[PDB]
Structure formats: C-alpha cells, structure tokens
From Swiss-Prot, chain B:
Other observations noted: High level of autoantibodies against RUVBL1 are detected in sera of patients with autoimmune diseases such as polymyositis/dermatomyosistis and autoimmune hepatitis.
Domain comment (free text): Binding to MYC is dependent on a Myc domain essential for oncogenic activity.
UniProt similarity note: Belongs to the RuvB family.
Its biological purpose: Possesses single-stranded DNA-stimulated ATPase and ATP-dependent DNA helicase (3' to 5') activity; hexamerization is thought to be critical for ATP hydrolysis and adjacent subunits in the ring-like structure contribute to the ATPase activity. Component of the NuA4 histone acetyltransferase complex which is involved in transcriptional activation of select genes principally by acetylation of nucleosomal histones H4 and H2A. This modification may both alter nucleosome-DNA interactions and promote interaction of the modified histones with other proteins which positively regulate transcription.
Tissues where the protein occurs: Ubiquitously expressed with high expression in heart, skeletal muscle and testis.
Record protein name field: RuvB-like 1
Domain of life of the source: Eukaryota
Subcellular location: Nucleus matrix; Nucleus, Nucleoplasm; Cytoplasm; Membrane
Taxonomic classification: Eukaryota, Metazoa, Chordata, Craniata, Vertebrata
UniProtKB/Swiss-Prot annotation, chain C:
Natural source organism: Homo sapiens
Compartments (UniProt record): Nucleus
Coiled-coil intervals, chain numbering: none
Quaternary data: Component of the NuA4 histone acetyltransferase complex which contains the catalytic subunit KAT5/TIP60 and the subunits EP400, TRRAP/PAF400, BRD8/SMAP, EPC1, DMAP1/DNMAP1, RUVBL1/TIP49, RUVBL2, ING3, actin, ACTL6A/BAF53A, MORF4L1/MRG15, MORF4L2/MRGX, MRGBP, YEATS4/GAS41, VPS72/YL1 and MEAF6. May also participate in the formation of NuA4 related complexes which lack the KAT5/TIP60 catalytic subunit, but which include the SWI/SNF related protein SRCAP. The NuA4 complex interacts with MYC and the adenovirus E1A protein. EP400 interacts with TRRAP, RUVBL1 and RUVBL2.
Family statement drawn from the similarity comment of this UniProt entry: Belongs to the SNF2/RAD54 helicase family. SWR1 subfamily.
Free-text tissue specificity from the UniProt record: Ubiquitously expressed.
Highest taxon above the source species: Eukaryota
Residue window of the full protein shown: 876 to 907 of 3159
Protein name: E1A-binding protein p400
Swiss-Prot record, chain E:
Tissue-specificity statement: Ubiquitously expressed.
Location of this fragment in the whole protein: 1168 to 1264 of 3159
UniProt signal peptide: none
Protein's cellular compartments: Nucleus
Function comment: Component of the NuA4 histone acetyltransferase complex which is involved in transcriptional activation of select genes principally by acetylation of nucleosomal histones H4 and H2A. This modification may both alter nucleosome - DNA interactions and promote interaction of the modified histones with other proteins which positively regulate transcription. May be required for transcriptional activation of E2F1 and MYC target genes during cellular proliferation.
Transmembrane segments: none
Family: Belongs to the SNF2/RAD54 helicase family. SWR1 subfamily.
Gene: EP400
Lineage, uppermost ranks: Eukaryota, Metazoa, Chordata, Craniata, Vertebrata
Quaternary structure and interacting proteins, as annotated: Component of the NuA4 histone acetyltransferase complex which contains the catalytic subunit KAT5/TIP60 and the subunits EP400, TRRAP/PAF400, BRD8/SMAP, EPC1, DMAP1/DNMAP1, RUVBL1/TIP49, RUVBL2, ING3, actin, ACTL6A/BAF53A, MORF4L1/MRG15, MORF4L2/MRGX, MRGBP, YEATS4/GAS41, VPS72/YL1 and MEAF6. May also participate in the formation of NuA4 related complexes which lack the KAT5/TIP60 catalytic subunit, but which include the SWI/SNF related protein SRCAP. The NuA4 complex interacts with MYC and the adenovirus E1A protein. EP400 interacts with TRRAP, RUVBL1 and RUVBL2.
The protein, known as: E1A-binding protein p400
Residue span of motif DEAH box-like: 52-55
Swiss-Prot record, chain F:
Protein name per UniProt: Vacuolar protein sorting-associated protein 72 homolog
Localization per Swiss-Prot or TrEMBL: Nucleus
Role: Deposition-and-exchange histone chaperone specific for H2AZ1, specifically chaperones H2AZ1 and deposits it into nucleosomes. As component of the SRCAP complex, mediates the ATP-dependent exchange of histone H2AZ1/H2B dimers for nucleosomal H2A/H2B, leading to transcriptional regulation of selected genes by chromatin remodeling.
Domain of life of the source: Eukaryota
Gene: VPS72
Subunit structure: Component of the NuA4 histone acetyltransferase complex which contains the catalytic subunit KAT5/TIP60 and the subunits EP400, TRRAP/PAF400, BRD8/SMAP, EPC1, DMAP1/DNMAP1, RUVBL1/TIP49, RUVBL2, ING3, actin, ACTL6A/BAF53A, MORF4L1/MRG15, MORF4L2/MRGX, MRGBP, YEATS4/GAS41 and VPS72/YL1. Component of a NuA4-related complex which contains EP400, TRRAP/PAF400, SRCAP, BRD8/SMAP, EPC1, DMAP1/DNMAP1, RUVBL1/TIP49, RUVBL2, actin, ACTL6A/BAF53A, VPS72 and YEATS4/GAS41. Also part of a multiprotein complex which contains SRCAP and which binds to H2AZ1/H2AZ.
Family: Belongs to the VPS72/YL1 family.
Modification(s) after translation: Phosphorylation is enhanced by ZNHIT1 and promotes the interaction of VPS72 with histone H2AZ1.
Amino acid sequence: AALVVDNGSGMCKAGFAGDDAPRAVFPSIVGRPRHQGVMVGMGQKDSYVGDEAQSKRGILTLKYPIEHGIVTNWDDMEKIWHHTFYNELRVAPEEHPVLLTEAPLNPKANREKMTQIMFETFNTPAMYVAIQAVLSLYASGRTTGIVMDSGDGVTHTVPIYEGYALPHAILRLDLAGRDLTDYLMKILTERGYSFTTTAEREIVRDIKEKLCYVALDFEQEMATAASSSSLEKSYELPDGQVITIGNERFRCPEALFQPSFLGMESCGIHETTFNSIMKCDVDIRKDLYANTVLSGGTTMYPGIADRMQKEITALAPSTMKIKIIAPPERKYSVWIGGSILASLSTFQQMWISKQEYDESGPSIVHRKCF
Amino acid sequence: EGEVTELTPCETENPKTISHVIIGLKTAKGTKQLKLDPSIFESLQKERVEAGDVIYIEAN
Amino acid sequence: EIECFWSNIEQVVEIKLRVELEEKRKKALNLQ
Amino acid sequence: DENASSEQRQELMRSFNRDRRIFCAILSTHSRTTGINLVEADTVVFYDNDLNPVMDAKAQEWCDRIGRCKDIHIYRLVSGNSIEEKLLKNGTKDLIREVAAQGNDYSMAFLTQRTIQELFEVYETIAPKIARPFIEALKSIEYLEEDAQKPSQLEELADFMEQLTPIEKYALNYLELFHTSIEQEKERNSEDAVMTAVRAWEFWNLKTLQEREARLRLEQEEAELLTYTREDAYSMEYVYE
Amino acid sequence: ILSYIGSHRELKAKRQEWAEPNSFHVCITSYTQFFRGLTAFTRVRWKCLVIDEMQRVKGMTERHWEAVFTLQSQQRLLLIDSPLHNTFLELWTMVHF
Amino acid sequence: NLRSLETYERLEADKKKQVHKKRKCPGPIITYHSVTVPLVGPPARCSRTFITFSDDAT
C-alpha cells in the first residue's frame, strides 16, 4: 500500500492508501535540549520529534520546520519524515511508495529538494506530490470549485477547475489558528487571566478548540453578551481554578473575518474568497460559487459555514447560486483526498519511478505533478 | 499530387483538438500547402504516408 | 477518474437507500 | 404479468414512471394491480374484456384510481359482429343471475334457449358470493386449457457492504450525510456557451487564416530563385523549334 | 410530522421526544398502535383528532369507542366515504363522538 | 421534508444526470465531432469538423 503523508504547518498526518483516516497524527515539531552539556553525558538523545518533544516541552526548545506552509528547515523536515516512517508507521520507505502534500505556490526548488530527499535519503521506489487544496476538493467528490483551506499557520483560497488549480487566482492570508490562539491569549490577559508559558499557550489552544464559535451576527452577539451572561462558559484549569469566558468565545474567531482585530490591513476570509472568485473567468465563477468547500482545522468552528454562506450571499450577485460545503471530517480532507488518489488503479501509472528520476533528475517532478 | 513535405496537424481550442491538417506537396514546378479537413488523418495513417512520399488526393 | 469513482459510490448509496426503503415499506405493510 | 413478483412489479412500474421514453406498458388484468398506486400514463387501452365480473370491477376501480390526478382517456377494443359486442352490452351479469336462479351448482345448470340464441345469433350488483361458482367454472376451464398445454436482500447488501474498502465506506457515509448534495453534478445549459464559442472561434480562425495569407504574401515578395544547376548552365544547349 | 410507527423501544424513544415543546405538529399512527398506546395518547393535550376510514376497521367495539371518547382533544374530525347505516347504535355513537 | 420527499419524488433530476452523462470509461479515445457553424465574412451556415485526442501519446 502506498503511503500518504500530509505535511501540515501544525500537524502531520500519515497513513496507508485506502484507509478512511490517517493512522498517525502528531505535531510537526523538533525539540532540542536547552542545556546540552549536563544532559548529553547521560545518554540522552540529541533531538526529540512530535509527541515526545511536546511531552518534554518544559526542557526542550521547539521549532517548526514549516512556516506558513513553506518548509524553512530541511534538516528538521527530514527528521520528521524519518520519525514518521520508522516510529509512527514502522515501515521501510524503500518498499512503499510515498505521496506527499504541498502548500499552494510551493517553490520549484522546494519540490526538487523533496524529490531528491525522497529518492536519495529514503530510497523510496516511487513518489507523488499533490496540492493540499486539490486533495481537499477530491475528498468531497468534486472536481471544479474553490477550496478555502485554513490550517495552523496560513490560510489559502484556491480555485480549482477540473482538478487544476488556477495559480493566477490563488490568494494567501498569513492568518490561521496560531494567530487566533495568540489573540485569545491577549484577550484573556485583558480579562485578567494570565497565560505566559508554552503549556499555558497549549491550554489556551485547547480552550479555543473547545469553547470558541463563529457568531452569525457579530453586532447582535456582542449586544446579547453585553445585555446577558447567557453566553458565558466556564473552563476548569489543570490546577482546579475555574475561569469564566464571555464574549471572547466569538471575538477570537471573528479575527478571521475582520483581520483588523489584530491590526492587519488584509481582507477577511470571505472577502479573500470573493476576490479570488472574481479573478477567475466569468464562465467558471458560477461553478466556483456553487462548489465552495471549507477545509482545514481552523474551519472547525461551529457556525463558520453559515457565516460564510451569509457573507458570500451578501457579496455575490443575487442571481448566483451560493452553496457552502463543510464536510464533518474536513480536518482530514487533505489526507483522505490523498488516500483516494493513491488508491486509484489508473494513478499507479502516475507515480514517479526511481528509474525516471535517475534518467531525468529532480526536474521530472514538474513534468509529472500538477 | 506531389511529394509530401510536411504533415503538421493544426491544434486548436475546441469551441488536443485539431481543426485542419496541413499537407505540404512538392512538385518539379513548386510547393503547395493544403488546409485539408481533419478527418484525412485516418487515411494518412492507413496509407502510411510519410515525409518524402509521393501521394495524390482527389478533390471530391 | 475521481468522478467515476464517486458516481459508482453514489449508485451504491442509491441501491442501499432503495433496499432500506423497501424494507421499511414491508414493515409498514406487515404491521397492519 | 402475474408471474412477476410484487418487488418486480414495483420495480417495473417505477422504471416506467422514471423513464419517460417507454411508450407503452402492457399489464395483465389478472396481475395484482392493487399494488401499483401511481401511474404516470394518461391513456389506457383495454384489448379484451374479462368475463369475470370481479376482475372487470377491479380493473375499472384501478383505472379510476389513476384518474384522480389527471384526465384519462380509456379505449375499449371490441370485435364487431362477434360475441364480444354482446358481452360488452350485457357482460356476464345476466348469465350469472340466470344460473344462480337454478341453484348454487353451476356444473349442472342449463341455460335457457333464449339466452343462448341472443348470445350466439350473430348478424343489483352481483356479490362475489353469488359469483363464486361462476369464477370456479372459469378457473376450471383455464386449468383445463393449461392441462391441454401440460438470504434477504438486506443480508446480500450486508455481505456486499462488508467487502467494501474503508475508503469506500467513508465515501458511503459521506454521501449518506450529504443527502442535500445528490445534485453534485455541474449540469448547466452548455448550449448557450457553445453558441457563443462557435462564433468566437470562427472569427479567430478567419483572423488566423488572414494572417497566414499575409505571411505567405510577405514570403513571396522575397526573391524566389538565386541559383540554378550546373547541368542547365553548361551541360545543355537551349533550343527552340 | 410524527409517524408513530415502530417497536416498543422505538415507540418509547418517540415518546421521549414528546416532552420537547414544538417537537412535532402532526402525529400519524395506526388504529392498532393507537389502542395499544392509549395510555400514552391520554397524556398529551391534542389539538385536533382525525379518524380516517374508521368504517373499514373490523373489530371496532364499544370499548374502543369509550377509549376514543376518553381522549382529551380540542377538536375531533371523522372522515367517512360511505353513508351511515343510521342504526340506533351508530347514531348514538356519532352523537357521543 | 422536500429532501426527504425527494427520496420518492426525485424521479427526474437523478435519472437525467445518471443517464445523460457527459463522460465515458477510462482510456484513450478519439472523438470525431461535426457541428453546424455560422458563416462569417435560417442564417448562412457551414459544416466544420473537429478531431479530439484524449492524451498526447495517442
């Protein structure tokens, strides 16, 4: 079975093609000891990856090799791939093809480096690169539409026509779950709850993922929160202290629609999607409006689909049919799409073989992957 | 009639799609290019016409 | 090829829904 | 026909209603039509008349049930100058009434010569209990002619669903949950786009061929010949007759 | 619409939804299930009671009529397709309905 | 309820989309196509032929 590896800015998902869910999901982080001298002598590993690094966050320095969807540390990315294959999947990469995902607008040099690493370091028999948004569209049984992908580090809107992403209309927004977590930390500090440590940052992330939601009408929700405490929810901290959260539940995710909350002059996700659709040909805009698929972990907020529908209906012409598609398992849409793609019998001829790499070099990836 | 000098199909977007098949024919008098109907591609491969082959094509 | 796969799965879903509807109609008829 | 199971009868009628191309549906009057509720047809043709009054009443009631939603035209074909005209005029009701007056044993009843002459000289509702021996006579005659001739589906799907790969099961669950997305196909009035694209292409082709002809004219304005063979120059003598 | 059809467990589950205000507007049930669950129906304040083709239900006893009369409902409607036999028992029962 | 009712009444859309498909089985295909196109400098029309190939290899 071919291996599918989703290279996400916050979480890495890996599994076997044909499965309905990834087998391993762990943070894409590499940890190194803060004080080498004392701890090297006692046989301690030089670096920790994924869950092991997260569990030792009190003594390790954590670094992300992927920033805003772009690989910035190739050594750490190689270490993450090694950890995935030998610790998470426990398989020999030389015996199984590997399908890798890439962010939109991925530099050609990065694709060549990925191909070189996969063929020379892991001796993989075959490999394929697929666009995350394209896989997200594939996971929903659609081939023409626009995918709004918002992960941990970056948000992209990608219009796709018959499986082909339109590069001239792809828009990038440097706003995602991490910025929302920092904003929640700031507003909780403004309410009186101080979170300063990385452990407290992860507590704030858990609070965001468990209690935040998107309001249909921000002004009406603010008036309701100012007039009644019915929207306040309690969260029990690990030390037993119970904190009360009020309007922060919906003010934090509102930053996705109004980046001005963070001081950013960029357009919201709805305006970004509308602008991306407006950059496409008029004949395909009708298909794009009717096939807007939400993907990514940052799109898991309850009510986001209704708000997106309302905003697009208010922005799009009244004669256009608007339909927002929000799959329940949209956080795994990329991996599911990759598993579907790698499970097709016709796709077995699309794999880049080691012979083709040896004959054409790393540039074959640009003539085989789209 | 003439010696075939080129058999280049004319690719196009459909309103790979070809809209014409250009055949270049050479005789002792000169050379002519014909904008033949695309359907002639079947007969060209059936007759195994190649560059440098003498052919003749009836108008009807 | 993806559209063909999803069309086949859609047909399978149609068949399943049809058999379940027929089972429900048979249960509704038998209870009388 | 009556040999088609109830599930087959429903499947065939649903196919007829769904596929608007099927022009005729031929049904046996002895088939349990009481299981067919909706019929998307507006015309009914009776090829022959059933002698069993109960079956004729059932067919009439069934035709009435279809007519609740649309005007229906019913045609009855009758062979002129035959027994069929008389059977259309009086049916079997008078015959059953005449035989019932002689007793409950139809196998030993004798018909009056007037009734026989009226039926064969070619040029108040009867309750089923009264008609039963007549129906048993009809059955007996049909059987004499015949002597002259003579795992639940859900368990199957469960076995099939157990052979589906996990990704196929996920696709099943996804399509089941997105019951509002059975119109996933981008069906649109392509004909208008084709109508505009054909003209746009025809103009583009006209322009491209005009540019090609202009390029050929420019190429022809350039000198055509600058050299000739040695044989023509020295190995031959130019003559004229 | 509430189709009151199912096994005892499914009917108990459907009765568990009776406590929610505005859970359903119209409830449809069979005569057999209607009389089998008479105790459940008497606990609900029904706005309109509709009885269809009751003349075709074999076995309608005087006790079934008493059960129909004991239901608290604001309005009762009877649908018949055939003329009444105008018998004393039938007319008395119609008056009580 | 309409979506529920369509489990019985969606006889039209689903059948039309399942029967009148615009695609066929995988593999190489050569499409001969001929349509009426209007003449340029009923209306004046001419016939034009297009030949379409599924893949660059063929």
